[PDB]
Amino acid sequence: DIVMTQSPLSLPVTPGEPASITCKASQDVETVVAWYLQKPGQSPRLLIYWASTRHTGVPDRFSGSGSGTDFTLKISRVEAEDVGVYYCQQYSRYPWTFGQGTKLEIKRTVAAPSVFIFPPSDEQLKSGTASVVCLLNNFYPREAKVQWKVDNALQSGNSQESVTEQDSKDSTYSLSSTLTLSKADYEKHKVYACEVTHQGLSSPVTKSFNRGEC
Amino acid sequence: EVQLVESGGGLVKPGGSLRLSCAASGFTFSSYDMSWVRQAPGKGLEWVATISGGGSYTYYPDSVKGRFTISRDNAKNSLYLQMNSLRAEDTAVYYCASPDSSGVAYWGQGTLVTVSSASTKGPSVFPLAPSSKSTSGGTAALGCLVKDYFPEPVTVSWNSGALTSGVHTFPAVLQSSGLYSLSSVVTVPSSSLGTQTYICNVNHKPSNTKVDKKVEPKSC
């Protein structure tokens, strides 16, 4: 088993700036190395083969180099249409092994999130469960923190969050933190609060609501 | 012109079997290698099998060796993967592929194979209504809670595809019940909430479920 070790795993790059991804094989694989780009929700697509040869239709700003155990993919001027996961792969010996992936994200200006909160619907409360959704919309970078306070009692391990892939227009992320409780436990408390911490925020932002007012 | 189309994916209980098909066109099928490469949701690529053009050489990794069997029919321009004794770590999108000297140059669209004990269940769609607590700067946020469905995937559109700008359908997370739950939100001008009707379109073909949910704002 040959191990393809990629570096880095996340690559924030400003448009026009060059990017380069390193891949190191656990043993000599000569030049039998291919590079793929996989855009979110699409199949992988071959960019470079035989360590350096460009596949048919790949723009000239992509290049590949390296031999033996050390290989490098280079994008001379990163366009917005290069976002995705980049894989290196050896096909010298079986089993064929890929890298862990390198997520290319566009580096942009710091944007603070717009925070929104949604109390459980009346239609859902009629069914036993109650989900309180806090939405962090359009922020950068991806690093964000969400704290749930139920009657000023900080919650822990009772909330699931989900992050969207980087937007293809403004290069921002959006986050949704859903606090799920039972109808009984939800009806026990009054103030439900969502506290957001982000690099673009001077101080933590809180969106609250009292139970039963909407 | 090379085209590869997979078939036969879906949900199966642990220990069960499943057979994947891959129809090929655009090249002399019997002269090229054919392969299967899978990818677990949100993870990397993993080579599953390869078969030679003549069909007398097959290659497997240790993780699937003894369970999966790659085979081909050169007279029918098609490739097969017989998957027996399926485990939960076999849940992934399976791409059929055709490698040559240039590596894995041709990929199919990939079909999803899900291995779980859960049962096919249509989603329950609840409205995330816009209110004073979901307004910030003249923009109001509304959305949809697509809860407790199985298996993947669902597709969510707004106003029958009319509204696309500013839509964020999050990645579904797996609940403790073994079912997927999901939120799809959109931000619109606050002055839209009274005059523009916002309707949630959730499609879940695994259970043949179609749900339309009109999101109406709260008077708060």
Next chain:
Amino acid sequence: RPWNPPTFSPALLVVTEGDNATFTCSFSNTSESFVLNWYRMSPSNQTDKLAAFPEDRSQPGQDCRFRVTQLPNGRDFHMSVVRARRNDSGTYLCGAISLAPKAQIKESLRAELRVTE
């Protein structure tokens, strides 16, 4: 397992302009995952692909004057230039790229072509 590079005969081939010229590239493969490339040389010892078997599926619409046929004996191949021009003369060779069990390229010995008047 070790295997030997392909052989490319004839070593020298002279043909008057207009006729077809045909080489034979023989390769004793150890697996079924391999390709044969047919190269034409440049003065810098640099390799230039003319055709390959099996056909390269990435860049189609290539020069139909350079063809590669697979004879049904299981090792022999015909690399033929149809209606050879004067400038078709030069150094030619074939090269095997095995893909299993180990990816490895071995080139054949070179041969010459002289298209005359």
